[PDB]
Amino acid sequence: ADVCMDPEPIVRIVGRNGLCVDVRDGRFHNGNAIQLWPCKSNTDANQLWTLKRDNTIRSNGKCLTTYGYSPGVYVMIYDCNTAATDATRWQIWDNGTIINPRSSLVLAATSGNSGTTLTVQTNIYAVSQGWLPTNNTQPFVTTIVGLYGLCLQANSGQVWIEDCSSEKAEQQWALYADGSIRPQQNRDNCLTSDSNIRETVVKILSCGPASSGQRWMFKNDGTILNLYSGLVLDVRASDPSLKQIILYPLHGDPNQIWLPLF
Amino acid sequence: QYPIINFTTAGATVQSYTNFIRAVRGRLTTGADVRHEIPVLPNRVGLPINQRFILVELSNHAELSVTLALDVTNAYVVGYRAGNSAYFFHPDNQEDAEAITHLFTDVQNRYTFAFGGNYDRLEQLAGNLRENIELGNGPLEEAISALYYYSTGGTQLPTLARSFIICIQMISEAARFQYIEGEMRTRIRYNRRSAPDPSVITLENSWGRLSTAIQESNQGAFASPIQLQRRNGSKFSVYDVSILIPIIALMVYRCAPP
Ligand SMILES: *[C@@H]1O[C@H](CO)[C@@H](O[C@@H]2O[C@H](CO)[C@@H](O)[C@H](O)[C@H]2NC(C)=O)[C@H](O)[C@H]1NC(C)=O
Ligand SMILES: *[C@@H]1O[C@H](CO)[C@@H](O[C@@H]2O[C@H](CO)[C@@H](O)[C@H](O)[C@H]2NC(C)=O)[C@H](O)[C@H]1NC(C)=O
Ligand SMILES: OC[C@H]1O[C@@H](O[C@H]2[C@H](O)[C@@H](O)[C@H](O)O[C@@H]2CO)[C@H](O)[C@@H](O)[C@H]1O
Ligand SMILES: OC[C@H]1O[C@@H](O[C@H]2[C@H](O)[C@@H](O)[C@H](O)O[C@@H]2CO)[C@H](O)[C@@H](O)[C@H]1O
Numbered sequence A: 001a002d003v004c005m006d007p008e009p010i011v012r013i014v015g016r017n018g019l020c021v022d023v024r025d026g027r028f029h030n031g032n033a034i035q036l037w038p039c040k041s042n043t044d045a046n047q048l049w050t051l052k053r054d055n056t057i058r059s060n061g062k063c064l065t066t067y068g069y070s071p072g073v074y075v076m077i078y079d080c081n082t083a084a085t086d087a088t089r090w091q092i093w094d095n096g097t098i099i100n101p102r103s104s105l106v107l108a109a110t111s112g113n114s115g116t117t118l119t120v121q122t123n124i125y126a127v128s129q130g131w132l133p134t135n136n137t138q139p140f141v142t143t144i145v146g147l148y149g150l151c152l153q154a155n156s157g158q159v160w161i162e163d164c165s166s167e168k169a170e171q172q173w174a175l176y177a178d179g180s181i182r183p184q185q186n187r188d189n190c191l192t193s194d195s196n197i198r199e200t201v202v203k204i205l206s207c208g209p210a211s212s213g214q215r216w217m218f219k220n221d222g223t224i225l226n227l228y229s230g231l232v233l234d235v236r237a238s239d240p241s242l243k244q245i246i247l248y249p250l251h252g253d254p255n256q257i258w259l260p261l262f
Numbered sequence B: 001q002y003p004i005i006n007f008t009t010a011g012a013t014v015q016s017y018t019n020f021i022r023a024v025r026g027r028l029t030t031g032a033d034v035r036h037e038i039p040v041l042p043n044r045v046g047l048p049i050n051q052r053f054i055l056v057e058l059s060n061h062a063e064l065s066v067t068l069a070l071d072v073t074n075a076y077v078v079g080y081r082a083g084n085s086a087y088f089f090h091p092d093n094q095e096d097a098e099a100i101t102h103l104f105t106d107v108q109n110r111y112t113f114a115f116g117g118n119y120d121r122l123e124q125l126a127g128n129l130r131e132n133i134e135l136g137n138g139p140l141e142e143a144i145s146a147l148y149y150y151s152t153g154g155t156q157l158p159t160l161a162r163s164f165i166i167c168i169q170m171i172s173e174a175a176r177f178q179y180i181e182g183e184m185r186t187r188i189r190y191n192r193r194s195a196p197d198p199s200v201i202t203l204e205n206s207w208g209r210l211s212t213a214i215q216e217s218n219q220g221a222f223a224s225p226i227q228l229q230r231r232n233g234s235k236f237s238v239y240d241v242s243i244l245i246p247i248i249a250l251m252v253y254r255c256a257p258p
Helices: B014-028 B094-102 B119-126 B137-149 B157-176 B178-189 B198-205 B207-215
Strands: A020-023 A034-037 A049-051 A057-059 A062-066 A075-078 A098-100 A105-108 A119-122 A140-145 A151-155 A158-162 A172-175 A181-183 A189-192 A203-206 A232-235 A245-248 A259-261 B004-008 B053-059 B065-071 B076-082 B085-088 B109-112 B221-229 B235-240
Touching: A034 A075, A158 A245, A259 B178, B004 B014, B014 B053, B014 B157, B014 B178, B053 B137, B065 B137, B065 B157, B076 B094, B076 B137, B076 B157, B119 B157, B137 B157, B157 B178, B157 B198, B178 B198, B198 B207, B198 B221, B207 B221
Parallel strands: B004 B053, B085 B109
Antiparallel strands: A020 A034, A049 A057, A057 A062, A062 A075, A098 A105, A105 A119, A140 A151, A140 A172, A140 A259, A151 A158, A158 A203, A172 A181, A181 A189, A189 A203, A232 A245, B053 B065, B065 B076, B076 B085, B221 B235
């Protein structure tokens, strides 16, 4: 029936460390900065954004505008008509990236600290550049089941696959808006991958750097893709015994397929 | 001739099941229309009756065989053949009634049930809710035999309806969600027979709503939240498409892309 009619939803924008895209101190004068800030449970328009049809993101009437088309400038709130036209335009991608078409610079937060000013960096699919439009302020907690029906499990600084004990040493994971996969019991730890090399062993380090090796995405084909490198989670030589999850190019066998069980 | 995928519960294994569903999905979509990484099903309007159905043939240990006919536009099980007879759920509109005419043209006896295939009607007749009907390979063997003998008259109506609820969930609902496929796959791996969780029942019910929300979302953002359930029953709301990408495998066409 007809052609699809995309609506204009009012939603929060959760990003790095589960923080929200906030308009500093609730003020809307042209230029006031945009910052990361603990998400609020209310209607303060300084934290709710309307995703317009024209591709502009508006809070309380003003446009989310970038200062310039240079890696490093900050993102400010501004009058939509006054602001340079294509400096208010953004596309929200399915892989949590919010890009400014015109400069190719992605909305980022180069610090996980509350109050950090948003900026536009060069795209490297890092956790510091992943965002998600949702009124859901909490990360999604699930069980990740993979090869042979075994569960993904973490033990301190390591991660391997093992049989699913519906209670065991935290096999529950929390998926953040920033695209990081965090161990339920220790939420400032990220499923990390040191290098983007054809066999590096995935481990659990701190989300501190929010690097591009800590951001993943669940594909429709059941794999877990590392956006930056293009490599997917792989259980080493279909051998759960080896206790090693590596980054490996895609081939689609059962050792690269995962399903989020919630 | 319509495409024919076959699966047998004889030496059924987790692999043969994953290939079966992979084959069923492979035949429903043409891969031409994909949105937010999720394949959409053909548009009903303008679809030549020669690419309107696919045929799934099931056979169990007892050597009994049955052939289900699924509608390619919604992965809906519209009828089936058993031996020399064919039975069709009561069509809910003229167009559909005219289409099932081209199915099982061979058969000497074509019967059209007085009821539809929808779950309510089927749960009512079965005398059970989807929540009490167990699923697994055991239940599928029993359902095939039950379905088969209905042609010879040795299957009561309550049991036919309980068998339709089993097949629909293990084939049509499994092809629609990787989540439900994995659910069925777990029941086979450990030889379990158990009714679907609140999570499965809810995903089945929200298929239409989700198909719509995603297709007419503004860049993956939904206009209104779709509410789903967890395995334990607790609810949660979905506002974005991204969290569903690894859960939905097929979408019923709702509207054209801009
Ligand atoms: C997220 O929450 C906000 C507010 O709680 C929702 O915004 C309201 O949306 C309704 C209808 O869409 C409007 O009539 C109200 O004016 C909005 N509230 C405000 C800010 O005044 C928003 O819809 C929620 N996100 C979604 C898509 O569910
Ligand atoms: C993130 O998602 C976007 C989807 O918009 C990807 O970028 C586009 O990819 C398609 C092909 O899938 C191309 O036709 C476009 O030219 C790309 N850019 C744009 C602006 O549409 C992007 O590649 C994805 N990231 C990764 C590495 O998976
Ligand atoms: O920037 C931090 C935080 O500010 C809140 O606004 C405060 C503001 O900090 C204060 O100077 C003013 O007097 O009261 C305001 C209301 O509490 C914002 O509400 C919040 O979203 C953050 O933006
Ligand atoms: O090198 C990791 C790589 O292993 C493959 O499995 C190999 C494995 O190297 C060894 O047991 C032998 O050579 O044959 C196996 C079967 O290919 C995996 O296929 C691949 O996904 C990676 O995990």
